Design an enzyme around this catalytic site. Structure first.
Site, mmCIF file in Angstrom:
data_model
loop_
_atom_site.group_PDB
_atom_site.id
_atom_site.type_symbol
_atom_site.label_atom_id
_atom_site.label_comp_id
_atom_site.label_asym_id
_atom_site.label_seq_id
_atom_site.Cartn_x
_atom_site.Cartn_y
_atom_site.Cartn_z
ATOM 1 N N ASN A 55 1.522 13.841 4.781
ATOM 2 C CA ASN A 55 2.303 12.821 4.103
ATOM 3 C C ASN A 55 2.744 13.317 2.729
ATOM 4 O O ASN A 55 2.036 14.108 2.096
ATOM 5 C CB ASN A 55 1.497 11.524 3.941
ATOM 6 C CG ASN A 55 1.126 10.896 5.269
ATOM 7 O OD1 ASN A 55 1.990 10.457 6.027
ATOM 8 N ND2 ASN A 55 -0.168 10.844 5.554
ATOM 9 N N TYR A 77 0.830 -1.196 0.000
ATOM 10 C CA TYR A 77 0.000 0.000 0.000
ATOM 11 C C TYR A 77 0.869 1.252 0.000
ATOM 12 O O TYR A 77 1.987 1.233 -0.524
ATOM 13 C CB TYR A 77 -0.962 -0.003 1.189
ATOM 14 C CG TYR A 77 -2.190 0.829 0.924
ATOM 15 C CD1 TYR A 77 -2.757 1.613 1.921
ATOM 16 C CD2 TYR A 77 -2.760 0.858 -0.339
ATOM 17 C CE1 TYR A 77 -3.874 2.381 1.667
ATOM 18 C CE2 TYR A 77 -3.872 1.623 -0.602
ATOM 19 C CZ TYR A 77 -4.426 2.383 0.404
ATOM 20 O OH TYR A 77 -5.537 3.147 0.142
ATOM 21 N N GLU A 81 -12.439 5.441 -1.566
ATOM 22 C CA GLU A 81 -11.030 5.731 -1.338
ATOM 23 C C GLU A 81 -10.523 6.702 -2.393
ATOM 24 O O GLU A 81 -10.818 6.540 -3.580
ATOM 25 C CB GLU A 81 -10.198 4.442 -1.359
ATOM 26 C CG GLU A 81 -8.731 4.613 -0.991
ATOM 27 C CD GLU A 81 -8.500 4.707 0.506
ATOM 28 O OE1 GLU A 81 -9.472 4.558 1.276
ATOM 29 O OE2 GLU A 81 -7.341 4.919 0.917
ATOM 30 N N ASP A 82 -9.784 7.719 -1.949
ATOM 31 C CA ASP A 82 -9.029 8.610 -2.834
ATOM 32 C C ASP A 82 -9.934 9.375 -3.802
ATOM 33 O O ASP A 82 -9.647 9.493 -4.996
ATOM 34 C CB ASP A 82 -7.947 7.833 -3.590
ATOM 35 C CG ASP A 82 -6.727 7.545 -2.732
ATOM 36 O OD1 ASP A 82 -6.562 8.210 -1.689
ATOM 37 O OD2 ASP A 82 -5.927 6.661 -3.104
ATOM 38 N N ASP A 111 -12.795 6.139 3.967
ATOM 39 C CA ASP A 111 -11.676 6.002 4.893
ATOM 40 C C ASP A 111 -10.840 7.273 4.978
ATOM 41 O O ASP A 111 -10.304 7.587 6.047
ATOM 42 C CB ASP A 111 -10.802 4.819 4.484
ATOM 43 C CG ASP A 111 -9.631 4.615 5.420
ATOM 44 O OD1 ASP A 111 -9.850 4.115 6.544
ATOM 45 O OD2 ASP A 111 -8.495 4.964 5.038
ATOM 46 N N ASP A 112 -10.711 8.014 3.875
ATOM 47 C CA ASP A 112 -9.921 9.240 3.891
ATOM 48 C C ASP A 112 -10.516 10.299 4.809
ATOM 49 O O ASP A 112 -9.782 11.172 5.283
ATOM 50 C CB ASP A 112 -9.778 9.801 2.473
ATOM 51 C CG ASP A 112 -9.034 8.860 1.546
ATOM 52 O OD1 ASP A 112 -7.835 8.609 1.789
ATOM 53 O OD2 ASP A 112 -9.643 8.372 0.573
ATOM 54 N N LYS A 168 -5.277 -1.516 -0.879
ATOM 55 C CA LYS A 168 -6.111 -1.305 0.301
ATOM 56 C C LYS A 168 -6.706 -2.617 0.796
ATOM 57 O O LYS A 168 -6.637 -2.934 1.990
ATOM 58 C CB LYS A 168 -7.220 -0.301 -0.018
ATOM 59 C CG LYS A 168 -8.060 0.108 1.180
ATOM 60 C CD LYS A 168 -7.292 1.048 2.086
ATOM 61 C CE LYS A 168 -8.219 1.893 2.941
ATOM 62 N NZ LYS A 168 -7.503 3.028 3.585
ATOM 63 N N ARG A 188 -7.731 11.840 -6.244
ATOM 64 C CA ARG A 188 -6.828 12.281 -5.180
ATOM 65 C C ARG A 188 -6.151 11.058 -4.552
ATOM 66 O O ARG A 188 -6.476 10.650 -3.436
ATOM 67 C CB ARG A 188 -7.566 13.108 -4.125
ATOM 68 C CG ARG A 188 -6.621 13.882 -3.208
ATOM 69 C CD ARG A 188 -7.052 13.838 -1.748
ATOM 70 N NE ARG A 188 -6.286 12.857 -0.978
ATOM 71 C CZ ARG A 188 -6.831 11.957 -0.166
ATOM 72 N NH1 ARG A 188 -8.145 11.925 -0.006
ATOM 73 N NH2 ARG A 188 -6.067 11.097 0.494
HETATM 74 N N1 LIG Z 1 -3.523 9.123 9.029
HETATM 75 C C1 LIG Z 1 -2.757 10.098 8.271
HETATM 76 O O1 LIG Z 1 -1.602 10.251 8.491
HETATM 77 C C2 LIG Z 1 -3.432 10.940 7.186
HETATM 78 C C3 LIG Z 1 -4.665 10.625 6.716
HETATM 79 C C4 LIG Z 1 -5.237 11.392 5.753
HETATM 80 C C5 LIG Z 1 -4.560 12.494 5.249
HETATM 81 N N2 LIG Z 1 -3.331 12.804 5.723
HETATM 82 C C6 LIG Z 1 -2.597 13.935 5.215
HETATM 83 O O2 LIG Z 1 -3.324 15.334 5.568
HETATM 84 C C7 LIG Z 1 -2.965 16.179 4.636
HETATM 85 C C8 LIG Z 1 -4.229 16.809 4.013
HETATM 86 O O3 LIG Z 1 -5.064 15.749 3.638
HETATM 87 P P1 LIG Z 1 -6.512 16.129 2.955
HETATM 88 O O4 LIG Z 1 -7.228 14.878 2.519
HETATM 89 O O5 LIG Z 1 -7.347 16.871 3.976
HETATM 90 O O6 LIG Z 1 -6.207 17.077 1.643
HETATM 91 P P2 LIG Z 1 -7.244 18.226 1.077
HETATM 92 O O7 LIG Z 1 -8.649 17.675 1.037
HETATM 93 O O8 LIG Z 1 -6.820 18.655 -0.310
HETATM 94 O O9 LIG Z 1 -7.179 19.518 2.093
HETATM 95 C C9 LIG Z 1 -5.997 20.269 2.086
HETATM 96 C C10 LIG Z 1 -6.141 21.420 3.110
HETATM 97 O O10 LIG Z 1 -4.975 21.975 3.317
HETATM 98 C C11 LIG Z 1 -5.232 23.560 3.153
HETATM 99 N N3 LIG Z 1 -4.037 24.293 2.843
HETATM 100 C C12 LIG Z 1 -3.317 24.314 1.719
HETATM 101 N N4 LIG Z 1 -2.298 25.160 1.902
HETATM 102 C C13 LIG Z 1 -2.395 25.663 3.143
HETATM 103 C C14 LIG Z 1 -1.621 26.565 3.842
HETATM 104 N N5 LIG Z 1 -0.423 27.318 3.537
HETATM 105 N N6 LIG Z 1 -1.950 26.896 5.081
HETATM 106 C C15 LIG Z 1 -3.044 26.348 5.664
HETATM 107 N N7 LIG Z 1 -3.805 25.465 4.981
HETATM 108 C C16 LIG Z 1 -3.473 25.128 3.722
HETATM 109 C C17 LIG Z 1 -6.064 23.642 2.160
HETATM 110 O O11 LIG Z 1 -6.743 24.967 2.213
HETATM 111 P P3 LIG Z 1 -7.960 25.306 1.161
HETATM 112 O O12 LIG Z 1 -9.233 24.646 1.651
HETATM 113 O O13 LIG Z 1 -8.138 26.801 1.102
HETATM 114 O O14 LIG Z 1 -7.630 24.805 -0.224
HETATM 115 C C18 LIG Z 1 -7.042 22.506 2.487
HETATM 116 O O15 LIG Z 1 -7.958 22.940 3.390
HETATM 117 C C19 LIG Z 1 -2.269 15.356 3.534
HETATM 118 O O16 LIG Z 1 -0.938 15.612 3.534
HETATM 119 C C20 LIG Z 1 -2.546 13.891 3.916
HETATM 120 O O17 LIG Z 1 -1.435 12.999 3.471
HETATM 121 C C21 LIG Z 1 -2.765 12.040 6.680
#
Ligand SMILES: NC(=O)c1ccc[n+]([C@@H]2O[C@H](COP(=O)([O-])OP(=O)(O)OC[C@H]3O[C@@H](n4cnc5c(N)ncnc54)[C@H](OP(=O)(O)O)[C@@H]3O)[C@@H](O)[C@H]2O)c1
Ligand SMILES: NC(=O)c1ccc[n+]([C@@H]2O[C@H](COP(=O)([O-])OP(=O)(O)OC[C@H]3O[C@@H](n4cnc5c(N)ncnc54)[C@H](OP(=O)(O)O)[C@@H]3O)[C@@H](O)[C@H]2O)c1
Ligand SMILES: NC(=O)c1ccc[n+]([C@@H]2O[C@H](COP(=O)([O-])OP(=O)(O)OC[C@H]3O[C@@H](n4cnc5c(N)ncnc54)[C@H](OP(=O)(O)O)[C@@H]3O)[C@@H](O)[C@H]2O)c1
Lengths: 559, 559, 562
Positions: B396, B90, B233-234, B256-257, B161, B143
């Site tokens: 990540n 994965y 997913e994604d 799951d996301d 997955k 995504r």
């Molecule tokens: N268990 C885990 O470790 C886990 C699980 C899931 C996700 N993640 C990680 O969490 C991160 C985000 O995931 P996501 O699914 O939520 O992506 P997402 O749906 O695209 O959301 C991204 C968020 O980050 C905001 N952003 C972008 N640039 C920014 C900045 N300079 N300052 C403040 N906010 C900013 C964006 O603002 P806007 O709304 O204005 O565009 C948006 O709200 C990823 O890196 C992902 O790998 C980790």
């Protein structure tokens, strides 16, 4: 077949070459990505991953994975450039690949039959899912050409051999079955190898071994018919000749290491006669080596001399053989059944160099795997005895050849007529003279012989068939190619040469009443063409039709 | 199944682990080399070829080839060291492997359904050869976690997955179906890529897109039952939330996301409460990011605060979110449905650094993929506002984390409670203090949730199930591990943790009358254990028996 | 696909396969060169059917038709359900298998013996269908009207299941008949050289109970806990014990106990529309105190309690006579369920004396004693009440308590009559005419089965049988009641069964017994979409193309690769 199983069927699966219409009719739509490629595009896609591999072994791996899933695309690759891929799917790569990686097939390719299965071979044949088998290539893996006793890993050789049957000859791959007979291995490296997957005991021999081969021939022909072609490959010397004499008149059987070798060697000799402008009767042959190849070549040469008019006893006396203990002469020690047939009335001679000087052969044939045996002295002697001496360095691989092409052309001052078993690039001497030496590839012989035998149900394969096959190959060479020192037609024409061999052989069988197929076709070429397997995908047409409207109205009863 | 087809069946094929007796009863003797290996030996053999690979991508290739032919051996490999292989089958490897090599499966792994198949999805489901499907993982590939729009190449992600469903949870792999919905791709690299195998047009969107998803859910549940688990997913942000609210109460569905992310993040927060010795009500949360992860985590935090006794409106005001345009406050521009739910009564603030200083959070959660956003100033501020500040750098991959584990422990002088989404090795500061930071892996959540849902036919998955799953994970951590800064149980215990999650979830469903399975088992642990898939080969026993001798004599009529 | 479709009775259409379907299935040449409508097929087979002049011979022809073309078989049955119900089920099926054994030339179900104990799950895998939703099981000990037929009893579940489909529209492919052979006590079968069953006496005791326990567990393990299992023609003690043991653990019922009760009470409730009094104004005397009596009496008490009568008062309205006389308190020879209806009364040995003392408003014969309803009994009823109810339910016709003619003649036209056996219309000497209805169990079980299978109802409480009785009683027209008919015409059985299924389904979702979800908004539209029809299915291939431009972009050749 229909449904999901068609994608797992290597003979019907087209991958992304399935049209949307074909996927729907087969009930597999959604199992394949939403893209529709031609076979030509599939060829380009797979060739990119092919060139990225850093070794021949890795390229063999790639091709075996492709043969696993899409046989039509696999033979599309092989036939796009037969000369390029032949050394990859077959020798010398297949032996090196299986020796290092073992067996890499991820789909069962044939049958493993062990000495411990004696008495139950008929049942084992039933595990093979194809009922219409017409050709069997079998090995026990004791003498893999160039590597020796590989035991169970020798299964790769019949798999590779049959690929050339299809790629070079057009034999239907679905009617082909490779068999590995595991009676053990005497390879000490394999017996102490923890990853070895064969029987970990020494080779069973004697009558218990012959009993197993007897049952094998009976079982195969009981299930698939007595017309089933059975070719023996990579058997040790003693077994090879014994098994050939035992079965060749009872079954549809031949041994390529003996007979295919003989025909392509005799083919090179006949082509060189077009340069020497003398008869086969004017020649004296000295063999460097006296094993399977040398005995096969010698016996076919005698058969050719007999056809020119030379009686058998006289023709035999034109052949001199040197083995590991010197010239083979009457009253020597360490002779056998085959060797006594060619024992000359002469004192003992220890060295090949002295035999060349005493008998002054018009042609020397090297089949002993001793590197450099055709010394500079031998080549210079030959070039002074005769105007155009014939030098065949047939031992494999290149490192074991009797001499190089360049050394023969240089020392004989460009008058030696050369052929090898391993490929040599073109030679150009200091004086500007250019030579393109030919390679005596067994694939010139066995694909076309097998196609005609299978086509006409030729019941047995007498040595006359290998002789006329050699005469056919010799006349394939053009005058320009002879002018360049080439004794064999180009490998890129192998499917055409094999087809012309198959027709000649088929015509010969009907004239000698050896063919089983009935009725005899009037147009033998059209008949054989209709049996040639093509890499082109077949079509899943439905064959729907209607009846005349009036007939359907009258035949349909309603209220 | 019987015969040759069993060797092509990945769920029954044992390769050389078939005993001679099994080969004979199956009618496949001779299709397999004459060696009889245990599964443990098969594991050793395959692990040697595994370590010779020079990249993670090549190791993924090796494992996909193994999953192609022997599923029991594949999961033997994965479960022998789950923490080692999880990053290979994965994320992050699967996305990189599919992005570079495309799809490498040589056996169809799932269904490709395109927007152009609208109206014919029921027929396409029939191409999948398994009728007893209980779990579906589906993506449209817009995504992919860390790589974005991979289009049709995203098929690798549900395949990977589901491997964790089975390896980490014990979900029956044969009852699992990965689906790729190809509505196009907006990846300009893919649209001009001649080797791309997906639809070469931009993504269909709007109601025409939702219509296809509507038919997909109906078709799947029509054929496999309304109890069929369907995990998304994604998916891109907007689609992800819209599709979740639309289906979560009509089908057995979760994302799951959004939700698995929420539960493992809330799990780390609950485990840190065992170190901070305060209530969830005493906390103020600042989110770096406001997308799928942040919204999911925030909504589950509010649900947890509500259970401690804090009313919803009050609990919401403890959550501050910063997006790409600054703090989310009432009356700001560029807000949406989700963002307005957490808009604070506050003036506009542009920088995360200023928000930390104004609101002084007890915990900061980074989910914006902006590297280094948790600056040295932010970490020092947090360490002066509160005794034990909570620092979650969840973005990540590692290169996009908000800070490193070492930077958090160093700047907070060892008082920060840290967790990340990417693995960090253990930190030891200059003063001798040692920390072992934990990784908030989603695999702590979705395998066990899926096992209990599938086990009891849990009809819908309300967020209470993800909350109690988080409470379960938090209590898995031992006191010694808390002493070391670990907020999560070890990954090597994942199958035990998932099983205990599955029982808790199953017990919750019966108490809320959400489970469909009847009758309710008295011993929930034994019930779920009986459904856990093991890598152990099953046995082809015959189940032969006789009748009493007297009964057979009387029931048999002869002359 | 292929030759095998012509041997599959669910798919075979015979000469109704069009040329286009024959080519598509790859069977062209296996069928004569003529193409028939199902309507023409129906006419051809009916002509053969009428040339037979035995009911037994008509049973055999219908069975070989079911052997080869199921859709046509049920087209025949549904064309005149009243005509063919007696042929494919009671009373012809019992007499057929008694005389010819098992005539099926295609395996119809599973034979599971006591000697197969411990391997029943294996034997279920011999049946080629995996989606079973209804099982009818018998041990052949009490074939209705004939007794112990042992392994020849397999004909009865096969005939029963045919009525599930013909009258109820239950999918026939989802039904499995089962014969549990534990031996036979029929001395004529044990001595018969041609007998095909276990030739020893019936095993009883724990080994019998354990076999049945494994059968219930094996069926539900493979086919799901929702799979309906209906018990048929068991002996009295086994029937009630097995019913009490399984009815709350499985989706189970016994038609001889509960279906009988449902249709008998339906006839009584219908008769209240003529007598125009409440059910609590009635006193019931039962001739017979066995399987049918106990079922009817327990449902009568339930309906009396719903009307509002206390249970002890409701039970006191019931008087039962067995082979020893009135079932009193303080007699000898009284069983379990018999003490429930024992009366604090002096002993009385004759049914005639019981009727003269109790003066009942309704007598129900379920004892299989011919002529038990004597002229004195009938004359006493008609003098005690203006419209007495006379139910001569014993089968066959020869063992009925009285004929419809005798009831109407002796009661001077005032008796309300119903029988188990079909009596033709009666015209008395004074000219009055009556059309007595038959209390057919087929009024009940097809509609209950359909509703239970459609909703995944987990268990079948007797309230479902009561509400089914109420539904049937309301089906009869006011004109038919004026002619003495207590049951709707058998020709309407399919519509009646649909309406019963809807009520059962409405009840099940109101008390949360139905496991099917989502709950359908419209219960009839839901059940209608599940009714099986004799219409041949279509073989239309789902073919389609993608839009031209989208397909051109997805088709790659050597020219358009770059
Ligand atoms: N268990 C885990 O470790 C886990 C699980 C899931 C996700 N993640 C990680 O969490 C991160 C985000 O995931 P996501 O699914 O939520 O992506 P997402 O749906 O695209 O959301 C991204 C968020 O980050 C905001 N952003 C972008 N640039 C920014 C900045 N300079 N300052 C403040 N906010 C900013 C964006 O603002 P806007 O709304 O204005 O565009 C948006 O709200 C990823 O890196 C992902 O790998 C980790
Ligand atoms: N179309 C082709 O190019 C083609 C086809 C087939 C074979 N070959 C090659 O021919 C060579 C021999 O093949 P094979 O099947 O005949 O092997 P073989 O059966 O083992 O025979 C080997 C022969 O070489 C003899 N020998 C060994 N050392 C010798 C020495 N110093 N001097 C003279 N003779 C010596 C051996 O003598 P003893 O009998 O005393 O042991 C034996 O007779 C191989 O290299 C093979 O690759 C080429
Ligand atoms: N839809 C229908 O019309 C329908 C449905 C089901 C059954 N039936 C008919 O009802 C009748 C009985 O069926 P069943 O299943 O209830 O059989 P059963 O349980 O084996 O026997 C019924 C009762 O008949 C009693 N009996 C025997 N001789 C008697 C006599 N001289 N006087 C009074 N009672 C006597 C028996 O008393 P003991 O207990 O002392 O032996 C027994 O209790 C059958 O003819 C059957 O065809 C009709």
């Amino acid at each position: 077949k229909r449904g999901y199983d068609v994608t797992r069927n290597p003979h019907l699966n087209k991958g992304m070459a399935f049209t949307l219409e074909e996927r729907l009719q087969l009930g597999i739509h959604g199992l394949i990505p939403p893209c529709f490629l031609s076979q030509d595009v599939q060829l380009l896609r797979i060739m990119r991953y092919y060139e990225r591999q850093q070794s021949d072994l890795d390229k063999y791996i790639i091709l075996m994975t492709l043969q696993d899933r899409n046989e039509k695309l696999f033979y599309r690759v092989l036939t796009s450039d037969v000369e390029k891929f032949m050394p990859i799917v077959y020798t010398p790569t297949v032996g090196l690949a299986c020796q290092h990686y073992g067996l890499t097939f991820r789909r069962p390719r044939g049958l493993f039959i062990t000495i411990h299965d004696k008495g139950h071979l008929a049942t084992m044949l039933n595990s093979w899912p194809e009922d219409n088998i017409k050709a069997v290539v079998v090995t026990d893996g004791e003498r893999i050409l160039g590597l020796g006793d590989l035991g169970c890993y020798g299964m790769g050789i019949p798999v590779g051999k049959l690929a050339l049957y299809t790629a070079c000859g057009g034999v239907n791959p679905q009617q082909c079955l490779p068999v590995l007979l595991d009676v053990g291995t005497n390879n000490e490296e394999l017996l102490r190898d923890p990853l070895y997957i064969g029987l970990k005991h020494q080779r069973v021999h004697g009558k218990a071994y012959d009993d197993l081969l007897d049952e094998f021939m009976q079982a195969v022909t009981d299930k698939f018919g007595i017309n089933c072609l059975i070719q023996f490959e990579d058997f040790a010397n003693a077994n090879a000749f014994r098994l050939l004499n035992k079965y060749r008149n009872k079954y549809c059987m031949f041994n390529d290491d003996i007979q295919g070798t003989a025909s392509v060697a005799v083919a090179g000799i006949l082509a060189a006669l077009r340069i020497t402008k003398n008869k086969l009767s004017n020649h004296v042959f000295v063999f460097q080596g006296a094993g399977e190849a040398a005995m096969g070549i010698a016996h076919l040469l005698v058969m050719a001399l007999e056809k020119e008019g030379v009686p058998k006893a006289e023709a035999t006396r034109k052949i001199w053989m040197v083995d590991s203990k010197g010239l083979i002469v009457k009253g020597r020690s360490h002779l056998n059944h085959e060797k006594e047939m060619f024992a000359q009335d002469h004192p003992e001679v220890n060295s090949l160099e002295e035999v060349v000087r005493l008998v002054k052969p018009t042609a020397i044939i090297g089949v002993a795997a001793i590197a450099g045996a055709f010394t500079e002295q031998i080549l210079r002697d030959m070039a002074s005895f005769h105007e155009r001496p014939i030098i065949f360095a047939l031992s494999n691989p290149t490192s074991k050849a009797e001499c190089t092409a360049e050394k023969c052309y240089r020392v004989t001052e460009g008058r030696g007529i050369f052929a090898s078993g391993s490929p040599f690039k073109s030679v150009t001497l200091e004086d500007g003279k250019t030579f393109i030496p030919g390679q005596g590839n067994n694939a010139y012989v066995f694909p076309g012989v097998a196609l005609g035998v299978i086509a006409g149900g030729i019941r047995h394969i007498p040595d006359e068939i290998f002789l006329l096959t050699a005469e056919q190959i010799a006349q394939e060479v053009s005058e320009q190619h002879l002018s360049q020192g080439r004794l064999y037609p180009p490998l890129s024409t192998i499917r055409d040469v094999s087809l012309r061999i198959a027709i000649k052989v088929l015509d010969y069988a009907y004239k000698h009443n050896l063919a089983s197929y009935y009725p005899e076709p009037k147009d033998k070429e059209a008949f054989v063409r209709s049996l040639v397997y093509t890499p082109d995908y077949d079509s899943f047409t439905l064959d729907s039709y209607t009846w005349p409207k009036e007939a359907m109205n009258v035949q349909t009863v309603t209220r």
